[PDB]
Amino acid sequence: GAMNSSNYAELFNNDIKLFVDDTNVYRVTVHKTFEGNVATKAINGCIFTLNPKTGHLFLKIIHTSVWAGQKRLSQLAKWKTAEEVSALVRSLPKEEQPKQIIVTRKAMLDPLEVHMLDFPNIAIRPTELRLPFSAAMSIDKLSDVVMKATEPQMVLFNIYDDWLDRISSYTAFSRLTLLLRALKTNEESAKMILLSDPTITIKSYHLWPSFTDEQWITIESQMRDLILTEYGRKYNV
Amino acid sequence: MNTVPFTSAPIEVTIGIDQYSFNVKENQPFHGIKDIPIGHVHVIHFQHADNSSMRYGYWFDCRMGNFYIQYDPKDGLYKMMEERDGAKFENIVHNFKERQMMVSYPKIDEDDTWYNLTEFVQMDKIRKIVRKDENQFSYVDSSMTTVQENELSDPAHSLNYTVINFKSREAIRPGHEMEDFLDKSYYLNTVMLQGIFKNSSNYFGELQFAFLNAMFFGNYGSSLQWHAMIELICSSATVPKHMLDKLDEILYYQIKTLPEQYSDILLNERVWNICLYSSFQKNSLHNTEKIMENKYPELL
Ligand SMILES: O=C(O)c1cnn(Cc2ccccc2)c1
């Protein structure tokens, strides 16, 4: 069944689950040709597969070579996503395989179900949550590793850094989605808030700054204010 | 010509025989149906006047024996029975008083509708879908579920149609996931035609049987099967030419026979829009497309 806000805390129980977001798999720039036409050029993409309880992100880099000589790429991209997610599940030990995979876009349902036929007890579900995982490429270290790739590549991250040492998975996911929503709403301003104190650094093995508990409270308030400010600007409120 | 003798008609009922129907009143002097033509297959069906719930009926081949109908006051339905003693049957069916209380099967000579609807339907295959080996005839009703439906609860009383499931390992070769889901030719040609049905005649026969069970009994699982078998062909880029041409004829006569007021429940809008306007074989169903657009434009 579809996931939403009534059964929201279920995301953080002990049944292993993965979110899959495909919005950055097939990425293009749009430019003008010599004849005056308009042409696309693909750039490297990624699949965003996240365990919301543990923070484990399986970032599969989609190199532009996979599109070469292929037709109907937006359709193919959904099947490619499903093929790689299935391969990921097959590569995990049984006790690490998910009980549910939640896709952020309903068009991923049939491709993933078909690729997952060998796993009949893994439920494939849409969600009614509007999740901002399309802004994953606004996280600098994720964008860097995707753009530098010269071949298909799987990169592993903990998208919560060390937060679970101090807060619950529920709270960590809420912080993640607030940060990503801010980066999706006003990327340059969200990036500014996070870099504004150069003495609070990002550890080599982290994605986000080493804020104290009180600093995170301030940062989260600044991100909420950014989102509300943009809403008012957009709707003249 | 063949006769279907009725011991009596104790309860008011609408009786169908093949594509025809008439009414019998409670305790009317009714002793059955005479003058039935050439019967490779026939179906006799019932809907009680005092309780339209459960339509039910019997598929039979006059060549496989002598079939009569008798009402059972305990189970409350008209039951088909076979008589092994031919002399006795010949004697009841040739009695001119009995024959005067029988309605004549009304075959217009121009009409070929019944053999267009049932050409590929065979009793031997019906009896594998409807498993009741001690009888030469086969009971179907409005409520009987299909094996597939049961897999998603009395296996004796089930419709054992060939299971068709587009998202199953049987339909999808490992390593060909996208290919086989978008083009069902493998599933049609290798799995179904070569593997299970063996030829297109057996395929069309189950398709036609499913349609007729859906129309005559309002059997939902039969309607699902009919549409599934249509969608499997239309969603295949590679289909023998003879099979496409024959499909257009088969569907044309099914749409032509369908009651006009039954389209909101016997036709699946999604499937028919895909087959007629989006599928690989859209342009291969000219006659079906033309009758659907003029007879049932609202569905499209
Ligand atoms: O057993 C048979 O051979 C048989 C033939 N007809 N019937 C039904 C019937 C019986 C009596 C009078 C009218 C019809 C049974």
Domain ranges of chain A: 9-163, 164-237
Q: Indicate if ligand 1 lies below 6 Å from the C-beta of B31.
A: yes
**A42 close to A67: Cβ distance less than 8 angstroms:** yes
Pocket test for ligand 1, best of B7, B44, B67, B78 (most atoms within 8 A of CB): B7
Separation of B39 CA from ligand 1 center, angstroms? 20
Nearest to A188 by CA among A220, A218, A154, A226: A226
**B118 close to B40: Cβ distance less than 8 angstroms:** yes
Nearest to A110 by CA among A69, A79, A84: A79
For residue A15, list its beta bridge partners. Answer: none
Nearest to B139 by CA among B35, B251, B1, B45: B45
Spatial separation of the C-alpha atoms in residues A214 and A220, rounded to whole Å: 10
* Beta carbons within 10 angstroms of residue B244's beta carbon: 17
Give burial (CB, 10 Å; 0-12/13-18/19+) of B24.
Answer: buried
Best of A114, A116, A119, A122 to disrupt the B interface (most B CBs within 10 Å) is: A114
**B81 close to B67: Cβ distance less than 8 angstroms:** yes
* Token digits of residue B299: 């569905």
One-character DSSP codes across chain A: --B-STT-GGGGSSS-EEEEE-TTSSEEEEEE-SSS-EEEEEE-EEEEEE-TTT-EEEEEEE-GGGGTT-S-HHHHHHHHHHHHHHHHHHHS-GGGS-SEEEESSGGGHHHHHHHTTT-TTSEEE-B-S---GGGGGGSHHHHHHHHH-SS-EEEEEETTTTGGGTS-HHHHHHHHHHHHHHHHHSHHHHHHHHHS-TTSPPPTT-SS----HHHHHHHHHHHHHHHHHHHHHHHT-
CA B166 to chain A, closest CA, distance in angstroms equals: 9
The size of chain B, in residues, is 300
Spatial separation of the C-alpha atoms in residues B95 and B34, rounded to whole Å: 12
Spell out a b/e string for B131-156, using b for 16 or more CB atoms within 10 Å of the CB, else e: eeeebbbbbbbbebbbebbeeeeeee
Contacts of A156 (CB under 8 A, 6+ apart): A56, A57, A58, A59
Nearest to B204 by CA among B160, B242, B250, B241: B250
- B28: number of CA atoms within 13 Å, CB side? 16
Give burial (CB, 10 Å; 0-12/13-18/19+) of A235.
Answer: exposed
How far the first Cα of chain A sits from its last, in Å, is: 37
Inter-chain contacts counted by CB atoms under 8 A, chains A and B? 23
- Tell me the CATH class for A164-237: mainly alpha
Q: Do domains A9-163 and A164-237 have the same CATH topology?
A: no
**A22 close to A77: Cβ distance less than 8 angstroms:** yes
DSSP B159: B
Spatial separation of the C-alpha atoms in residues B213 and B230, rounded to whole Å: 16
Closest residue CA from atom 12 of ligand 1: B7
Q: Indicate if ligand 1 lies below 6 Å from the C-beta of B30.
A: no
For residue B24, list its beta bridge partners. Answer: B13
3-state DSSP call for residue B260? helix
**A124 close to A103: Cβ distance less than 8 angstroms:** yes
Closest residue CA from atom 11 of ligand 1: B7
Q: Indicate if ligand 1 lies below 6 Å from the C-beta of B67.
A: no
* Chain A residues close to B165, C-beta within 8 Å: none
CA B264 to chain A, closest CA, distance in angstroms equals: 27
Among the partner-chain residues B167, B174, B178, the one whose CB lies closest to the CB of A113 is: B167
> What experiment produced this structure?
X-ray
One-character DSSP codes across B185-253: HHIIIIIIIIIIISSHHHHHHHHHHHHHHHHHH--HHHHHHHHHHHHHHHT-S---HHHHHHHHHHHHH
CA B195 to chain A, closest CA, distance in angstroms equals: 21
- What backbone torsions phi and psi does residue A117 show, to the nearest 5 degrees? -60, -30
Spatial separation of the C-alpha atoms in residues A182 and A188, rounded to whole Å: 10
- Measuring CA to CA, how many Å separate A226 from each of A79, A156, A193, A221? 36, 30, 10, 9
3-state DSSP call for residue B24? strand
* Chain A residues close to B178, C-beta within 8 Å: 76, 79, 111, 114
For A9-163, CATH gives 3.30.420.230
Radius of gyration of chain A (CA): 19
Q: What angle do CA B252, B202, B162 make, to 5 degrees?
A: 100
Spatial separation of the C-alpha atoms in residues B67 and B101, rounded to whole Å: 17
Spatial separation of the C-alpha atoms in residues B183 and B276, rounded to whole Å: 16
3-state DSSP call for residue B88? helix
* Beta carbons within 10 angstroms of residue A130's beta carbon: 8
Spatial separation of the C-alpha atoms in residues A161 and A175, rounded to whole Å: 12
Nearest to B234 by CA among B169, B160, B172, B288: B288
Say what the resolution is, in angstroms.
1.5
DSSP-derived pairing of the beta strands A100-103 and A17-21? parallel
Spatial separation of the C-alpha atoms in residues A62 and B70, rounded to whole Å: 71
- B72: number of CA atoms within 13 Å, CB side? 9
- Sign for the CA dihedral angle at B93, B94, B96, B102 comes to positive
**B60 close to B73: Cβ distance less than 8 angstroms:** no
